[PDB]
Amino acid sequence: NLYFQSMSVGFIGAGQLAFALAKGFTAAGVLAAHKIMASSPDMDLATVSALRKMGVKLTPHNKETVQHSDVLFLAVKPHIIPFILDEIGADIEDRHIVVSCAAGVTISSIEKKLSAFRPAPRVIRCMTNTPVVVREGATVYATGTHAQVEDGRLMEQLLSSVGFCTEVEEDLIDAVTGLSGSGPAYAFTALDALADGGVKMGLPRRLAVRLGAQALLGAAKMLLHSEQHPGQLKDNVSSPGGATIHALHVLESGGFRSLLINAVEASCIRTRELQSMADQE
Amino acid sequence: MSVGFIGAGQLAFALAKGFTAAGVLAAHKIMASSPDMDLATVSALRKMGVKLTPHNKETVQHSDVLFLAVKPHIIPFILDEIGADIEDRHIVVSCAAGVTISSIEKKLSAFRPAPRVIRCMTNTPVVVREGATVYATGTHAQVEDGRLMEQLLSSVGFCTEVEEDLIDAVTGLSGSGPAYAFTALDALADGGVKMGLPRRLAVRLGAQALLGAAKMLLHSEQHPGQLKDNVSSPGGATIHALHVLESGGFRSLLINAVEASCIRTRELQSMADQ
Amino acid sequence: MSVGFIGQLAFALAKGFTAAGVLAAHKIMASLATVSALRKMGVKLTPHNKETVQHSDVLFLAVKPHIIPFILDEIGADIEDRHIVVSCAAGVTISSIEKKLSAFRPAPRVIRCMTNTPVVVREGATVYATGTHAQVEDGRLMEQLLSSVGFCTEVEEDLIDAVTGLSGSGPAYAFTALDALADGGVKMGLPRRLAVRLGAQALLGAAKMLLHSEQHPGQLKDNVSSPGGATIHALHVLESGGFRSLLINAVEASCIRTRELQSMAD
Amino acid sequence: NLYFQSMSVGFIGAGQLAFALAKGFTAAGVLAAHKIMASSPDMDLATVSALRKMGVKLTPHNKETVQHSDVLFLAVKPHIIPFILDEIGADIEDRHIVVSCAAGVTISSIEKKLSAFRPAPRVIRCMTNTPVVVREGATVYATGTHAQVEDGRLMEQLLSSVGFCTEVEEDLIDAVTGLSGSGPAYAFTALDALADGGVKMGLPRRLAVRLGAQALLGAAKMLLHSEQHPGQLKDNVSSPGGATIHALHVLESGGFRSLLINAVEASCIRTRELQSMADQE
Amino acid sequence: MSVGFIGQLAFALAKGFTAAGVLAAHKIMASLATVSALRKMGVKLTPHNKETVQHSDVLFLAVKPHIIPFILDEIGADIEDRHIVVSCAAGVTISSIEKKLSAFRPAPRVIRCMTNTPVVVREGATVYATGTHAQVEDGRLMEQLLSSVGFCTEVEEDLIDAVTGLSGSGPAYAFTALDALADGGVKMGLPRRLAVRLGAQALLGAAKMLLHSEQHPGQLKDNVSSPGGATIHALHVLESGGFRSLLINAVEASCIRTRELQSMAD
Numbered sequence A, D: 001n002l003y004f005q006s007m008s009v010g011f012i013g014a015g016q017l018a019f020a021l022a023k024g025f026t027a028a029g030v031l032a033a034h035k036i037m038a039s040s041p042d043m044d045l046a047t048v049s050a051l052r053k054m055g056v057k058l059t060p061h062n063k064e065t066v067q068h069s070d071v072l073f074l075a076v077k078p079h080i081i082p083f084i085l086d087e088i089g090a091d092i093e094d095r096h097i098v099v100s101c102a103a104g105v106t107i108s109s110i111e112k113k114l115s116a117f118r119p120a121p122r123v124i125r126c127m128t129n130t131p132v133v134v135r136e137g138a139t140v141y142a143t144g145t146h147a148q149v150e151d152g153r154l155m156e157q158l159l160s161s162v163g164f165c166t167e168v169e170e171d172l173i174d175a176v177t178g179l180s181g182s183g184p185a186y187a188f189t190a191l192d193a194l195a196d197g198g199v200k201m202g203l204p205r206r207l208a209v210r211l212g213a214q215a216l217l218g219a220a221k222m223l224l225h226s227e228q229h230p231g232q233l234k235d236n237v238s239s240p241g242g243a244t245i246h247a248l249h250v251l252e253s254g255g256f257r258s259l260l261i262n263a264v265e266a267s268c269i270r271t272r273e274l275q276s277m278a279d280q281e
Numbered sequence B: 001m002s003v004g005f006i007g008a009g010q011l012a013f014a015l016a017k018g019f020t021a022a023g024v025l026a027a028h029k030i031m032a033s034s035p036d037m038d039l040a041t042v043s044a045l046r047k048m049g050v051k052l053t054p055h056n057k058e059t060v061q062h063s064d065v066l067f068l069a070v071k072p073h074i075i076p077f078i079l080d081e082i083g084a085d086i087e088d089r090h091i092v093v094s095c096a097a098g099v100t101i102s103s104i105e106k107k108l109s110a111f112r113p114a115p116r117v118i119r120c121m122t123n124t125p126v127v128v129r130e131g132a133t134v135y136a137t138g139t140h141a142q143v144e145d146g147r148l149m150e151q152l153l154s155s156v157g158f159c160t161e162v163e164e165d166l167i168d169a170v171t172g173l174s175g176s177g178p179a180y181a182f183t184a185l186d187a188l189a190d191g192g193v194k195m196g197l198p199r200r201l202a203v204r205l206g207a208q209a210l211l212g213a214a215k216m217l218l219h220s221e222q223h224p225g226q227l228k229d230n231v232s233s234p235g236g237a238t239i240h241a242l243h244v245l246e247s248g249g250f251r252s253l254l255i256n257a258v259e260a261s262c263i264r265t266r267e268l269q270s271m272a273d274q
Numbered sequence C, E: 001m002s003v004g005f006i007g008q009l010a011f012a013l014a015k016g017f018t019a020a021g022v023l024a025a026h027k028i029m030a031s032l033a034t035v036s037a038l039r040k041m042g043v044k045l046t047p048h049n050k051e052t053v054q055h056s057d058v059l060f061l062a063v064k065p066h067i068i069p070f071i072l073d074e075i076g077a078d079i080e081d082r083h084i085v086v087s088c089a090a091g092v093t094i095s096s097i098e099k100k101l102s103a104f105r106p107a108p109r110v111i112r113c114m115t116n117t118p119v120v121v122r123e124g125a126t127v128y129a130t131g132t133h134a135q136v137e138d139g140r141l142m143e144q145l146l147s148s149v150g151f152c153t154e155v156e157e158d159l160i161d162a163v164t165g166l167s168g169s170g171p172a173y174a175f176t177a178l179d180a181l182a183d184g185g186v187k188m189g190l191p192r193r194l195a196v197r198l199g200a201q202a203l204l205g206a207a208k209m210l211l212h213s214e215q216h217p218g219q220l221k222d223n224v225s226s227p228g229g230a231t232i233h234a235l236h237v238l239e240s241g242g243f244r245s246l247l248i249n250a251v252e253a254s255c256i257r258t259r260e261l262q263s264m265a266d
């Protein structure tokens, strides 16, 4: 609905997240690759080589990225953000929307640094995940103190092109990190294990990987397109005395559900802990 | 071409819905028979354009490809009921759990000598055209029958041919798989709720995370452990979470599940015949 | 019609039936602790199993499973055509009863039933299976009679072992859970009497919500738990101990033991 | 028996507890639905459209609910209760009875906020549960400093129409929260798992759900109508060598009793924690 | 002499004392379920705690631990020099009682006691510690009185928390064990009533053997177990579940909770 074929996007950081978003945005056709600039500390990653081939402009100077861009994604380690903010703070102009993707880093900490330079920085905090690279990401965002109303709409329009996107209150983002931020790693672990189980029972490894991934994708899509509770879908597919209900019993006996709860909790708690350590420093 | 379902349970409904959404045949070319069809399935199928009848004989006479989608122990009764009505044109596709090509051909061969039988292992996500299917061809299935099966089931998801002796393992992996995923998504959502998310949002994010990760793996040549390595930054939230999964033996539980489902399927393969 | 009993479940059904007003207490004859209460109700008592048979139309057998063959050998000559013989003994099959009774008269009308103790407060759960010679109207009569003291439905006989593991043993799972929940309340500072009352009321209310809802139990669970709240914290510690798997283990163990009793008999 | 057919009831919050109480009250016939008003920050909730169909008046303004009501239920999240009190404190009148249903929120905290506006607020604290929707709830309440003796009796009459209700000392309410407040969720978990066990052993899912729920309902009623210890009732069910005592052994081997003790403790401890975190702010 | 009570342990001691014949039931005054039984015995009842103080020489305080300060504030002005105040409240220290009572009269005679419910069958286990102002003859009088309903010995006050974890909570460990042993008997085919009787008789006999033996409990254990036999097989499964460690955990948990109550008070 918004015309942003003239919009320039910059990434500070040229790692996994910058590649994933840039590949997703250009695959969606919402951004031309030549309108994307990325800056990296080391021009020796495979990520910067793939970005170069996409047509993304690459530079070693964070200041160049700032001057080129309208929307500026900060995709660096959480503990690097306060060094980037001190570096680029004077170059932030009124046109800029600063989008922080660093886990744990609060809007208040970013606005505090940038406000020392120019008084009303437009800041958005987001938590996205690597599946944006195949345009099936899960993203949430929260708008900062000086973010205008169209800033949030622009950001939802941009991130919706590469997956699910919705606005949340900032105090939910650490929990989202433990669920959909870390979620793909839980799935990769599960898929590796499911493939081992297929191999134990006689399947070739390549087929077992394909079938397990297709099973997970189809089940996830079923749930997304259904109004039904996941327990109801579980109920619908477990015939009496059959193979599936026998397998569900052995999952329950090992406390499978509790492990996944433990995981979301552990990732969320670590996210809160990393930020608390940063605020102390 | 006409398709029939003997059975109107969840799997027959999912295949009929997926086939119609695929447009590979008009729904008026689909017929389903059940002696006990619930009003919800009858209403949805009828609003779908699928013909309905209580007489399995009418389904057989209507159909070219005949899906047997009933509980395993019901199969011998169906075959004795319809066996005399099986013509040379029919391809009989069995979806019943653990029912062997041998037990079907032995029954049908008493009526007419060369029944064309295919054994199928599919799953419920065919309803959103993202199923995972394998099939094995019987003694008298012509080479064109397997090709026709593969084209048909490819319209509602992944499909490939296997030897019949792998179908029990596939059952434990992609047949039961969606249930493992529904269990995991329920627990992941509980985790999100424990950490402060509304249930509705937690369910959506967990399912989107699973869908995206599975698509990444399907569209990548890299090992799932490599994709996991790419997600986990040093000292970060994800590697902390992976450790608590490892401490509970998460991987072993999923191996246990595939094995338990496969072994139960073999028990159904046996106790059928003995 | 007249009803006869040949125990704990014997008293429960007579108490429930009379409270239901479906049968007058004197049209009921029975054949200890439980025998003192029945006399108060007006239930006729007799030590001779043969007297209960002669005055009854519907005949409940509520004795231990390895005691049925001896009762059938004693009463078998007295079973007339008017009799419906209803066996409540766990694990005793219709086949075993019919085999014994058929030595006397060729077409015994046998029904096998699986009920539970809450019939004494008219909230039982009962299933029944009809035998070879039971008329269609016999199953309907049994459903009407046992519907007066709880839920009742017909099943195939091969499901009764599973029903036994679920609603037959079910009340004992609940009594164990209620004792433990009350201990938890006491640990956190509640008086024992209030803890028992609150825990039982919570279980009763939740069970009634589910029976009166179309929704899945997980959906009702989701409605209790506010984000970050007390309930979701408690649910996590249940999951960490494999709570669900323990209840699956229980239903399985009771079902499998019932099958062993269905076999040891033969 | 106090006369209150013509009194007005308000809910601050239109969530699950407001729906359950409103449904129970109207099904009991003790309140007409048009005498009920509820306010919610979000109107797209399923619970809000259901309240509309019942005839309950819905408003986005908490002030209108106060001015409409005689008895005011606070049925919102615990951590926001302090913002509500600041928002409607000036609109509390001498006629009002404020009934807080929030877990952990103490009478003293409510009275301290409301006393800033008008000196003797009438406050009652209660802990109820969702089965009030089928008129089988379990409710306890404690009366505040300025609650008249008739306010407690009115409270007990009203909540007795939808379940068990009794007065307690306030220092028991956190323990009640872990037992009958969270209790229904323990039962729903148990019923799901019991049905799974029935399905594993060959029952259709719908029958297994019905049988399991009826077993638990009947057992609970037996205990409520018996003077006997639950261990004695357990002994009456368990014939020697039989199916039930075999199942009880596998429950004991998994520490089933300890898990339920752990749950009550965990819910109670979290309830105390929430209030302690609130008082820190 | 006259004795006064200010509950469950209140009834147990009055029942034991009267069965012992050490005190006439009418020389005992007390201040519900338990109050209906005491009236049958002849135990004088009164709602006013001040009346029990005025008619008593030895004064037992059998109320909840956080209730003692309120009782001492009420009766403190009525404590005369003739009084021995015996506190049975778990975790209430001699220091806390003396502090309260010393505000009224300077030298209150206080004894702290740790007893258990089996005093009701005159097989209790009691220890006591004497306070700052208790005369030597007060401890001797208390030992004589409480020896009439079980074992009794003097300890230092700093051992009473540990005693609480062992013989104070001990009977509940035994009731749990007896319930479980009976369930085991029922699982193997015994009727419940016989199983409870046999299990309790086994525990009583073993306990008496140990009390009347000079030998170590392990030596007595060795005498039960024949080589390759049933008992040594059962002992192995106890060891495999860490049975011993569970009982150590219990004594520790009860002792530590008692210390928390000894502190939360202050």
Ligand SMILES: O=C(O)[C@H]1NCCS1
Pocket: C224, C225, C226, C229, C230, C231, C232, D103, D177, D181, D182
């Ligand atoms: O916040 C919650 O989890 C509430 N659930 C019922 C008791 S408190």
Ligand SMILES: O=C(O)[C@H]1NCCS1
Pocket: E224, E225, E226, E229, E230, E231, E232
């Ligand atoms: O042989 C043994 O272990 C004997 N011990 C007492 C019961 S049998």
